[PDB]
């Protein structure tokens, strides 16, 4: 009964276009395919905008005020969004490919490089109410005979330098009266002009060409005219200049060549500050901070993004996304981290809070098909089509063991015993499930009985039974542990594609080729429920199709499913453009999510293969925190979260219950009543107000008297709040009071409080321990220095 909304995209930090630093310099904006991602460098956080273009983004820009962001796709269609509120403001179609867009330093005007024409427009006022037609063109300039490479604003909002493919840099005046001031065309370069910039005084103009020549222009007597007083050359053996940027205040020139290396120069002296290489791929974009201390670089081929602090030669940000689609994903047991795997064969470990890759593993030769964690969480397992299964120790980030079959069987699915002592994998070519011992690495035995390829596996987290399904139209429950081995096959109407095990371990759900999600009781081995999914699934006609979408049957099933940790909902996805969230007990569709709206992607709407990228979801999972679910797709790891909680969802509300009455209860010191009333309203701000207003002396009295119905809610509130809050001791006092007061009740109902307790343990382990761990080491370090004999 929660509303999930798209929050951020992991696995991709830069696709193409231009990256822009925020005016404050604390945030970086990177176009990620069809959307824009914003990275909080100082706070080490990220989010992705919910708005979506028809096609891939081409040019973006944020005004100095930090209120308006403009994004333009490859078709010229623009979207204006309110940066502060993250809401789309207006859509306008420029009807031409805009190479670049830049706001004036005043912010009143912004300029467009459209073909060989410079268009200047007026910036809509954010404060004013929504306008039907807010965009008004200030002027259109037509001087160049070829496409404009880039444009640069003067510091005073009075002149613009435009560099084109005509081997010419040309200046204009924003004010018509000032046309006589700047109406000059600069020539002399032997290749395309990539960048023209003002000096800080604006007396000097620097122009940079693709061939690698920097011309310094000054207004001097031969009566007076612009002349090339000094000429500098980049003596790159074959690399061509790809992107150029200049910071007038610090006189820093950052240039990225096609060879994949960038140089920092001090103008006009041309002193090579530093030269580094990110790789063999071209450096598509370069950006500078407002202060000029941070340089952001971007390479489109491998999706690399680098934020470089040249003052201290330190890396604020250093990331690279998956080159291939993410075939699988796995959450850490506490939800702190998510592991993703790609068709390349490389595994990447991500941090949910920061959204950044902690480590990359390249041991697997071929595509990694599945990734799973042990119940303890320190160890992670992965299977690959190269014919190996590998165990990864994530505390030390090492592959401490590798498992393989006798005859190099390709593995597609994987399952790990809750005890972390047995590993099982399945294949599309063998029909047997290979079992290994984690400690020894030897083949215990091969589970036989399937007459088709094994499509999916799963261990029960509690009962430790193994459930396998196949294209044999059957499901088998294996009781491998114990003196005797039993197998209980269950028949199904069609091939089984995906399988999910209920967290309590008492039921298993399977998605079939007929588009059916069927739920079975494991102990009784009888069906208990069924859900239709064919009609809910949204599949678009491919551009190459010769048959209609409604008649099409390419993918009207779900290839991946997963239970919610409460057990009452299933999220499903497949080779289609829809992610459907159902409710198991009542078998209805809670909500459907459109995966992508990019028109380029095929499914959104004799020797040569007709192939283009398609929209498809490879794997889906619920976050163990019970606030989000991640879906691996072609573009990247989509994460939908319920964090915002703008909805009004009162619980057992009454006429007497009002936010004013709750505050009055605090004023009268009726802390228990105020807290209960706040929960009944279910407003986070009111709950937070009451939570922080309860004195330490009164906490044990309040905690012991909380009604049992609200206990799962308050524990969930504390765990989520405490992870990012600063009141570490205040939260620990609350947790101690609740656990001591309601410890027995939680034990009696473990499944009810499974998610709430897990969030609590994450706070006590991931933040609380690190504080005391550093506090204690100082204590012992202190004692040694004072107690020990000093050096000679």
């Amino acid at each position: 009964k929660s509303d999930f909304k798209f929050s951020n995209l992991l696995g991709t930090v830069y696709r193409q276009g231009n990256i822009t630093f925020s005016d404050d310099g604390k945030q970086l904006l990177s176009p990620v395919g069809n959307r824009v991602s914003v990275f909080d460098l100082i706070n080490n956080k990220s989010f992705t905008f919910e708005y979506e273009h028809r096609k891939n983004i081409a040019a973006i820009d944020l005004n100095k005020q930090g209120t308006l962001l403009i994004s333009i796709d490859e078709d010229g269609r623009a979207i204006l969004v309110n940066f502060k509120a993250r809401n789309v403001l207006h859509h306008f179609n420029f009807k031409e490919k805009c190479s670049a867009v830049k706001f004036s330093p005043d912010g009143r005007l912004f300029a467009l490089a459209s073909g060989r024409f410079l268009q200047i427009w007026k910036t809509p006022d954010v404060n004013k109410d929504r306008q039907f037609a807010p965009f008004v063109r200030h002027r259109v300039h037509a001087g160049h005979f070829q496409d404009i490479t880039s444009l640069t604003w003067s510091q005073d909002s009075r002149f613009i330098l435009t560099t084109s493919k005509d081997l010419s840099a040309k200046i204009w005046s924003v004010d018509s009266e000032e046309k006589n001031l700047a109406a000059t065309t600069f020539n002399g370069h032997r290749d395309y002009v990539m960048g023209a910039f003002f000096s800080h005084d604006q007396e000097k103009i620097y122009t940079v060409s693709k061939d690698g020549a920097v011309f310094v222009w000054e207004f001097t007597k031969r009566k007076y005219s612009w002349r090339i007083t000094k000429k500098h050359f980049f003596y790159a053996n074959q690399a061509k200049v790809k992107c150029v940027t200049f910071h007038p205040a610090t006189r820093l020139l950052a240039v990225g060549f096609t060879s994949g290396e960038f140089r920092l120069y001090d103008l006009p002296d041309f002193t090579l500050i530093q030269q580094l290489s990110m790789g063999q791929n071209p450096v598509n974009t370069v950006s500078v901070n407002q202060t000029g201390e941070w340089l952001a670089f971007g390479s489109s081929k491998l999706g690399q993004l680098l934020v470089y602090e040249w003052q201290s030669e330190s890396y604020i940000l250093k990331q690279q996304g998956h080159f291939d689609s993410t075939n699988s994903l796995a959450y850490s047991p506490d939800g702190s981290r998510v592991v993703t795997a790609s068709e390349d064969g490389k595994i990447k470990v991500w941090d949910i809070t920061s959204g950044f890759c902690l480590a990359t593993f390249e041991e697997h030769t071929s595509s990694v098909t599945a990734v799973q964690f042990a119940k303890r969480g320190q160890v992670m397992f992965s299977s690959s089509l190269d014919g190996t299964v590998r165990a990864w120790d994530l505390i030390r980030y090492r592959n401490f063991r590798t498992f393989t079959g006798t005859e190099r069987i390709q593995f597609n699915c994987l399952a790990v015993d809750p005890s972390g002592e047995v590993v099982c994998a399945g294949s599309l070519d063998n029909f047997d499930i290979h079992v290994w011992s984690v400690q020894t690495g030897q083949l215990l035995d091969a589970l036989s009985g399937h007459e088709g390829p094994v499509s999916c596996l799963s261990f029960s987290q509690e009962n430790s039974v193994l459930a396998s399904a196949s294209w044999d139209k059957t499901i088998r429950i294996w009781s491998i542990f114990g003196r005797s081995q039993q197998v209980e096959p269950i028949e199904v109407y069609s091939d089984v594609l995906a399988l999910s095990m209920r967290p309590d371990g008492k039921e298993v759900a399977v998605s079939t080729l007929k588009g059916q999600i069927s739920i079975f009781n494991i102990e009784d081995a009888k069906q208990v429920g069924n859900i239709d999914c064919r009609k809910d699934i949204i599949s678009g006609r491919f551009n190459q199709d010769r048959f209609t979408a409604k008649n099409s049957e390419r993918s009207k099933f779900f290839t991946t499913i997963h239970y919610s940790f409460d057990g009452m909902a299933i999220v499903a996805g497949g080779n289609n453009n829809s992610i459907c969230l159902y409710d198991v007990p009542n078998e209805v569709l809670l909500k459907r999510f459109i995966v992508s709206r990019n028109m380029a992607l095929n499914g959104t709407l004799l020797s040569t293969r007709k192939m283009r990228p398609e929209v498809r979801v490879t794997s889906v999972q619920f976050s163990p925190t019970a606030n989000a679910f991640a879906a691996a797709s072609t573009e990247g790891l989509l994460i939908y979260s319920t964090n915002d909680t703008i909805l009004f969802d009162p619980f057992d509300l009454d006429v007497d219950v009002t936010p004013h009455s709750t505050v009055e209860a605090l004023r009268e010191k009726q802390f228990l009543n105020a807290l209960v009333m706040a929960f009944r309203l279910n407003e986070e701000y009111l709950i937070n107000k009451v939570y922080e207003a309860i004195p330490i002396k009164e906490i044990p009295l309040v905690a012991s008297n909380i009604p049992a119905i609200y206990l799962p809610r308050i524990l969930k509130f504390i765990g989520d709040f405490a992870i990012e809050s600063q009141h570490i001791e205040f939260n620990l006092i609350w947790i101690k009071a609740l656990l001591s007061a309601s410890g027995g009740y939680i034990n009696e109902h473990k499944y009810l409080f499974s998610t709430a307790m897990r969030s609590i343990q994450r706070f006590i382990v991931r933040v609380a321990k690190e504080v005391v761990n550093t506090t204690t080491d100082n204590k012992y370090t202190y004692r040694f220095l004072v107690s020990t004999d000093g050096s000679m």
């Binding site: 003067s154 510091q155 005073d156 009075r158 002149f159 200046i171 006589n180 001031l181 700047a182 003002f198 005084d201 604006q202 007396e203 000097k204 103009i205 000054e218 207004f219």
Partner: peptide
């Protein structure tokens, strides 16, 4: 001025 405008030597000989 450009049309686009806005609006001791320490000796190196040291005794060794």
């Amino acid at each position: 001025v450009a049309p686009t405008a806005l609006k001791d030597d320490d000796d190196d000989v040291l005794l060794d």
